[PDB]
Amino acid sequence: KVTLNEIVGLEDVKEALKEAVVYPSKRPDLFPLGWPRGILLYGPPGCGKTMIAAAVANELDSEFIHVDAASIMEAEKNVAKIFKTARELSKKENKPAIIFIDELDALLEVGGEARVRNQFLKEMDGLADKNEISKVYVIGATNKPWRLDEPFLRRFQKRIYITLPDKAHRLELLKHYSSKVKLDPNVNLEELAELTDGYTASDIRDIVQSAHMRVVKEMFEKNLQEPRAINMDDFREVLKVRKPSVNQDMLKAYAAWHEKFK
Amino acid sequence: VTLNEIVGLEDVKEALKEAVVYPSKRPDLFPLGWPRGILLYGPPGCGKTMIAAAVANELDSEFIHVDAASIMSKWLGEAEKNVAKIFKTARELSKKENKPAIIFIDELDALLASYTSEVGGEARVRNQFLKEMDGLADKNEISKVYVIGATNKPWRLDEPFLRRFQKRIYITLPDKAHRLELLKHYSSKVKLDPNVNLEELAELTDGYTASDIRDIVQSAHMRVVKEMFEKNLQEPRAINMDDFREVLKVRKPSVNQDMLKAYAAWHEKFKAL
Amino acid sequence: KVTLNEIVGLEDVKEALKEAVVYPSKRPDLFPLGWPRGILLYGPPGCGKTMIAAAVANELDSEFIHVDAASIMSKWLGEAEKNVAKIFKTARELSKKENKPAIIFIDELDALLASYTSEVGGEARVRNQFLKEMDGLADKNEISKVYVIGATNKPWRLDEPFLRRFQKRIYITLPDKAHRLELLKHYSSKVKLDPNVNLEELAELTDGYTASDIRDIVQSAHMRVVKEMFEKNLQEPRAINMDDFREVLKVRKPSVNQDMLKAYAAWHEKFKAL
Amino acid sequence: KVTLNEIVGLEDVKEALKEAVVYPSKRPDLFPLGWPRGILLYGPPGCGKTMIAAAVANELDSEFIHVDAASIMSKWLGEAEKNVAKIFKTARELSKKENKPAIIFIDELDALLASYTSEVGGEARVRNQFLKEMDGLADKNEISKVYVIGATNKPWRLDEPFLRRFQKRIYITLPDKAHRLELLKHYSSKVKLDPNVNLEELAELTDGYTASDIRDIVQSAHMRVVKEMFEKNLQEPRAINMDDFREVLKVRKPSVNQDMLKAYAAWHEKFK
Amino acid sequence: VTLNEIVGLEDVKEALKEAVVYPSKRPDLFPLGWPRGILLYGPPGCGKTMIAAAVANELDSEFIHVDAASIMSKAEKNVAKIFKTARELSKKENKPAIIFIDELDALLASYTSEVGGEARVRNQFLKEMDGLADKNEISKVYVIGATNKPWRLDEPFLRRFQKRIYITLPDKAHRLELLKHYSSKVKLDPNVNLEELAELTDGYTASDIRDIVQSAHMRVVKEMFEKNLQEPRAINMDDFREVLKVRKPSVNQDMLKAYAAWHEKFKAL
Amino acid sequence: TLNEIVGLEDVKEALKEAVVYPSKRPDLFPLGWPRGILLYGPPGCGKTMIAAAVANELDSEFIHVDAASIMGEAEKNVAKIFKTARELSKKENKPAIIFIDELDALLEVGGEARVRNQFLKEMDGLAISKVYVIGATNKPWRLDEPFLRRFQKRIYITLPDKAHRLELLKHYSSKVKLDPNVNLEELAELTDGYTASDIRDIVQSAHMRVVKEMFEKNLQEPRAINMDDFREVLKVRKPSVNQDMLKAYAAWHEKFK
């Protein structure tokens, strides 16, 4: 159960994902010059690229063949099977199957490179338009597109920068991660959102979790029945110590690669 | 898809004719011979691949297409087996029927790297290939076969490699008149709506490669399909001129102003022609 | 045999260990955003990161599956994978219906990132198999319960993927004055000490020494006295004096170099995570 | 080659080749401290080092065992040793009782120092086997006679052991004005030239071009004229004019970059 | 070749006794135990190898000698065996065995397969020393490591050698008994007065004393055969004088400051 | 014999010291004597000819091997080279001398260690008696601190002094008709800094000067050689040993005597 509720906002990113995949599914005839089956989600880590890609499969009541490139690194037997089954699972029932690759970086001594990598690279040239069949997509996810190699890179024509979340994005996160921790007024999430400039969505969950943990520590070593109501100065003290997980230089390194490989 | 000019780039075109179509039609006229190695270098997207296809079809000729990426990664140590075969078959397919065959190499840059592990990836496969071109010259006549190499990164290209391509044609970023016929060809079948006047777009798109024209129209048409969805409807909206306007604020030329100066440098200093 | 009543490290280290592991054990419902199963003990060596982790198992009447990363790399063969899956296997299994949480302890966590032969079975094969196991602890059809305490003196070695399957990281700091005292007591244990010694003023003289090189300082002070009995030719050893500690404390310095102290302190601030 | 052709390269190149090889052939007794059998032709590319070395064999009615170092590395995976010994084998053999000295010529000498697969067999195995062969040419009073002319555009690659089995090193320099003239003649050969062309002032206009990119300049000037006939639709080509050379000489520059020129010049002075 | 002060250097010696001869003679007296790893570090030539032999023979003990060079190039199989046999050779007969490692530095480099070089063989060995501690008693076996380059020595390696003895460049009184021991059998001639040599040889290692006398004696044999006698002449003061102009100390003044630094920051005890 | 190289005494007496004495009179060396001997210096000084001189001083066998050549096994040969040298040192106590040209060249699993430690071991073995190993190198940088300690005797074959050069200039004048006015002495001192190798070159190239003449002049006989021949050939030809290699040797020399 994870439709387009969904991630919290992010529209820009989202409509560009629709554009790539939801439309040619709904109406292929409208794309005479075709449309690319390879799609790349690149950005700082924690922004939960894995959850976004799940959202599009469920938008299309579609199968979501998830694989972590770590594990899959023969091993040729598996890489052909992952496509195999996705095409197969795209039955006469034109339900498009979505293959999702976590840590795409990790696909990059004779058998390590090439053997398993070109076998996979080839598979994507195949998705194009061999006697129609059609349907199957590949969403690759990476926090390190530096690793990504100029051949690899051209079997992913659609590349969407999952950006670090803006102030308005954070707010609805801070809401969604407040969800069920009894919050106490005086907290005013809005001023947090803006205090949390530069944090990924991952290390927001952390912030709240560690703030709420603050309160549970009290109940135990105070010996209260119930936790304390979670205060604003909880966030303040936890926000001194916890910093953004994405370093200012990684931020300039992404920004560079982004403009040179749109 | 013959040499009607894929699109009115004349300058480029006549220099390609010069290199290949003439010696085919009339070799006796070239007593000092003529070079079989020919290099298409410039910013990417200008579709060097389509141009080279045009010359084969100008000569009712075979077009042996190969991406240098694959020939490096995709085999093993003995990716030598394939590089000799590519020439093999092109000569063979240049039968008694003096139909000249054209080998086209996408990403020529890629023969100079991509070895990963086992030893060099250099020399073994590269000199085998470099040798093959010395062979095209004039070994017991036979003749006929050409090599069109394509690259967006002639920096990579190495001063030995370079000299088995004596004919070098800068495929330049397309001029206003070129663009127009592209904008036409990529409008082809997207219901366009009057008020659009392609001419003033062609001139608005100064500095874009031919690749990121297809993008601009595709993304403008995508604008109209986005509307149809959740409003519903089976035809989309009629594609407007302010579509192009808003899409043209966000989408910029894919070829960076510094790459433009880097090509221009290498063009003047390495490339006589 | 050694529960987490514990002697001193409250302020920081111990309560931060409780926080991580003892609470979610006693009361999981109180953590709706869950809680991390991977927990990292990083600091200068000698502070006995191994004895601390034992303390939390015995706090939870819990099993303590101890493994040295050295052995799991060198020992076995190519299929040292067989062992790494078994270590988790048995810990889950031994976390029976009896919701007693099992605690895997990894000495020298650094050592999973090198020490092989067939370049390619060395890395990845065994390392990702292990890295994967920890993603598994999270929340696969509940089961729950099992933890991983990794210990290291060299978190520089530690690698940014590895690092993120240990979300709880506790700097086991060089021991404070109050800590030392109860060590100096525990290592005096049975060496006839002689009054005039007053351990308190030692504890404060031994600012900057690890717990390891306290045992050394007393052992070498007591050795001072045995040297006497022999080359003096006395029948008992001498009673161990205070000026023993003084002259042994000139020569023996802290084992943790002032630069390794700045190197920890750096890594600490750039990879904090409570 | 028939007096060893007076192509022009007198002071410097040719006499220095004669010096090395033609004299000890004609009159060994005159060299009591012996004379080196390894001889290196190093310079910018295109100057046709391969044609020069042919000239010396034909000066001595001598055999010219030509081998490209590329091929000898590539073929016969590991046992490309079999060929390298055979090349010398045959050259000594072909230097029969008939004291005709044989000349081995090695194109791209640089290429013996790379281009392999198995770490251990690439270097050493084939390279020392070859290096050893040259120590053999010295004397062991078995045969004498055989020489090795190595050719390279990249003597940087050349390695300080390799280097010392070539004691005679001749910089084949970019061709002088007088040299060019007889090239411009030889490459005019059969392209109907038209008076008004006066090759002499071209030779001096083409200062800094290698011999290779002179063939290019004329070929591309003649191509100028054929382009006319076609798009003009004339029945013959046009007669090749002087302003052809002029407009082709704006665009075509020397193929040897001014920095390569300083890099050779450096290596030249540090390894005479 | 026991000790007793067979070489005449005490400070070093009593600190070696302290470490090893006492716990052998009377373990009960050490309740906090005693370290089995012991490190001999200093300038080269001072013959660390002969010193360590002396303690084995002090204890009628076995002396398992191994050069770390060989164990690297010429390997896990052997490193376990070296300990294996030393424990085994420490039979019910509580005769403590002593493993001696020449060039301890050499366990930290070598190799061929980067990764079997480090760790594989090094940690196997490092583990072995944690084992000597007190696994179900057994006890007895020691490890004397020798090095001229403790810079190489690595802060983990270092801490399985808790006893570290700086074998210092030999003092004037030490040298004398060397000059005696290396005159041993070269017919010396009066006029020579070894005492004033000992003090002339300030700053030389014990190694380059053997050299100085050998090369002085060589002076006299060269005469024989440049002059043509059947035995040597010969042997005299002024030989030493001329040979002492040319031959200098083998231990450079900067190595001297580098040891001295590493010694202070930080030697144990 | 010891004619021999021409006259380098210093070097020579230090070679005698190492090898000729313990051969004639071992009893005089109670602390033994080293069997491994290293000849290190700039190239061309003909280390190979010097080592031949000591074998012939001892009417001794001279097992010559280039480390280039001896580099899948190759272990078979390295054991055989010692084998035969010990064997050839028969009951007849004639000491055999193994000479290794380019010792540097002994330094993927089989390349290092396999053949190298097999060889390193052989020298620990020499410690029967009789057999020696003279290793030669122009690049003792390559030489490795284990290798290096199985060669306890190390003699810097220095760039040849003025008196040395003279008898070379004589020996390489040997048979080229020289012409008075030449006065070799002032050449020897003009040739400060040249190796013995690039003396042979100097004369050979000076004599070649004269043969040039005969040919392009068309004389019957060469011209007589000269003095200003040497002068012009000495402008162009410089020492083959670079001033930096000179400082690099000098460094290694003092740090590894």
Author numbering:
A (entry chain E): 96 to 168, 174 to 208, 214 to 367
B (entry chain D): 97 to 369
C (entry chain F): 96 to 369
D (entry chain C): 96 to 367
E (entry chain A): 97 to 170, 175 to 369
F (entry chain B): 98 to 168, 173 to 208, 214 to 233, 238 to 367
Q: What's the publication's text?
A:
Vps4, a member of the type-I or meiotic clade of AAA family of proteins (ATPase associated with various activities)11 disassembles ESCRT-III polymers from membranes, which might be coupled to the membrane fission reaction itself. Proteins homologous to Vps4 and ESCRT-III are also present in the Crenarchaeota phylum of archaea where they catalyse final steps in cell division, virus budding and vesicle release. Vps4 contains an amino-terminal microtubule interacting and trafficking (MIT) domain that interacts with carboxy-terminal peptide motifs termed MIT domain-interacting motif in activated eukaryotic and archaeal ESCRT-III proteins. Here we characterized the oligomeric state of the Vps4 homologue from M. sedula (MsVps4) that belongs to the phylum Crenarchaeota.
